[PDB]
């Protein structure tokens, strides 16, 4: 079977549960498309009711910030006539506005501006769909694929720079507030039976180091790479290359979303994380199997310094096996970050800078996450992870 007709193996992670992930492998010849621009992609996907098995091949670079004539769109094209960053900054300055959500004219103008961009860059993927990169250079630039459906396969594509021109100021976010942006490369919002494999995710030609600071906080134009929220379940993410980005993957969006308990069953294996700051992943509630992943970075990088790998959030149940972390000078405890409600973590075979460590025990956590993985392929010895992952992870390694 060619790349477009391949399906997820019957034991390959949580994605293989029940009906498994076959994407659009059963598509008839008339539902097999090759797309090379935004117009073709949107037409091939159709609406949310287009559940007919379909295979979409991406050829070349697809820029999502383009109009209907495929001409580039910049900040001014999306900007509401009444929006002005200078006026917005003056209006919501914490010294005069205080710590409360922005409201009024400038925030309304900012929100309208953001909705203009959202209409072009966010695309919903319908059920029973396989989207694969043709050849070695398939790319999606600026777009945010949203998956709310069942049975979707995304492979061999490089996703770059899901950039938000109008970040929202949120003074109540954290201790000193933060600027929040809306687009990920891939957003799994209630989606089920998904396989993301051999993809590459990065911030393209607009790294966060080029962003200014307003109110003492970075003016962040990016959000996540592969995030999962609102009951997403039965997902396998394998052989992906995540690099040069801040917040990579958040599974479970809120401590109050107790409906996520029993869901967010995600398997992450053979992924490469290079120069990723945090959230790799940051989990709430889910039974997440993390194995054979390779993490590399530096705490003194000038662009994307390592902060932590695994985020232990409320009721998270990370089961980690044979993962390798290469961050010179890092202490064993700082491989992870423990958040509100995070009490347990099971990790075995963890290597930090070639040394066997126990991340859970270094943070005084419980090792009882209460479950044991049932769906997984062969687990590589920790000593072989770095080579296997560097050589095989990312887009352009298959075709
Ligand atoms: Ca997100």
UniProtKB/Swiss-Prot annotation:
Optimum pH is 8.4. It catalyses: Eliminative cleavage of (1->4)-alpha-D-galacturonan to give oligosaccharides with 4-deoxy-alpha-D-galact-4-enuronosyl groups at their non-reducing ends. One of its GO terms (cellular component) is extracellular region. Ca(2+) binds at residues 184, 223, 227. The active site is at 279. Residues 96-118 are annotated as: Disordered. Its EC number is 4.2.2.2. The keyword Signal applies. Pathway: Glycan metabolism; pectin degradation; 2-dehydro-3-deoxy-D-gluconate from pectin: step 2/5. Keywords: Calcium, Lyase, Metal-binding, Secreted, Signal. Optimum temperature is 42 degrees Celsius. Residues 98-111 have a biased composition (Basic and acidic residues). It is found in: Secreted. Binds 1 Ca(2+) ion per subunit. One of its GO terms (molecular function) is metal ion binding. Disulfide bonds: none annotated. Its cofactor is Ca(2+). InterPro entries: Pec_lyase, Pectin_lyas_fold, Pectin_lyase_fold/virulence, PEL. Induction: Negatively regulated by TnrA under nitrogen-limited conditions. The keyword Lyase applies. Belongs to the polysaccharide lyase 1 family. Produces unsaturated products from polygalacturonate. Monomer. This is Pectate lyase. It comes from Bacillus subtilis (strain 168). The lineage of its organism: Bacteria, Bacillati, Bacillota, Bacilli, Bacillales.
């Amino acid at each position: 079977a060619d790349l477009g007709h391949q399906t997820l193996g019957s034991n390959d992670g949580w994605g293989a549960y029940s009906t498994g992930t076959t994407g659009g492998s059963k598509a008839s010849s008339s539902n097999v498309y090759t797309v090379s621009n935004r117009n073709q992609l949107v037409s091939a996907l159709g609406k949310e009711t287009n559940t007919t098995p379909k295979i979409i091949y991406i050829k070349g670079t697809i820029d999502m910030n383009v109009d209907d004539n495929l001409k580039p769109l910049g900040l001014n094209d999306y900007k509401d006539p009444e929006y002005d960053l200078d006026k917005y900054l003056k209006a919501y300055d914490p010294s005069t506005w205080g710590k409360k959500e922005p409201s009024g004219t400038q925030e309304e103008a900012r929100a309208r501006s953001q909705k203009n961009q959202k209409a072009r860059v966010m695309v919903d993927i319908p059920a029973n769909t396989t989207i694969v990169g043709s050849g070695t250079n398939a790319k999606v630039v600026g777009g945010n694929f949203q998956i709310k459906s069942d049975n979707v396969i995304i492979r061999n594509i490089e996703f770059q720079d899901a950039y938000d021109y109008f970040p929202q100021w949120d003074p109540t976010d954290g201790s000193s507030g933060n600027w929040n942006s809306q687009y990920d490369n891939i957003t799994i919002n209630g989606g089920t039976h998904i396989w993301i494999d051999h993809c590459t995710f990065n911030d393209g030609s607009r790294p966060d180091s080029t962003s200014p600071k307003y109110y003492g906080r970075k003016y962040q134009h990016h959000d996540g790479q592969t995030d999962a929220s609102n009951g997403a379940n039965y997902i396998t993410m394998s052989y992906n290359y995540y690099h040069d980005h801040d917040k990579s993957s958040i599974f479970g969006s809120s401590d109050s979303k107790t409906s996520d308990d029993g869901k967010l069953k995600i398997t992450l294996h053979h992924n490469r994380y290079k120069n990723i700051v945090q959230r790799a992943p940051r989990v709430r509630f889910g039974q997440v199997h993390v194995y054979n992943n390779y993490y590399e970075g530096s705490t003194s990088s000038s662009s994307y310094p390592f902060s932590y790998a695994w985020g232990i959030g409320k009721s998270s149940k990370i089961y980690a096996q044979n993962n390798v972390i290469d961050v010179p000078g890092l202490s064993a405890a700082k491989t992870i970050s423990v958040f509100s409600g995070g009490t347990a973590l099971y990790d075995s075979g963890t290597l930090l800078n070639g040394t066997q460590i126990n991340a859970s025990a270094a943070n005084g956590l419980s090792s009882s996450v209460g479950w044991t993985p049932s769906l997984h392929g062969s687990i590589d010895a920790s000593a072989n992870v770095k080579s296997n992952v560097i050589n095989q992870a990312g887009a352009g390694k298959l075709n």
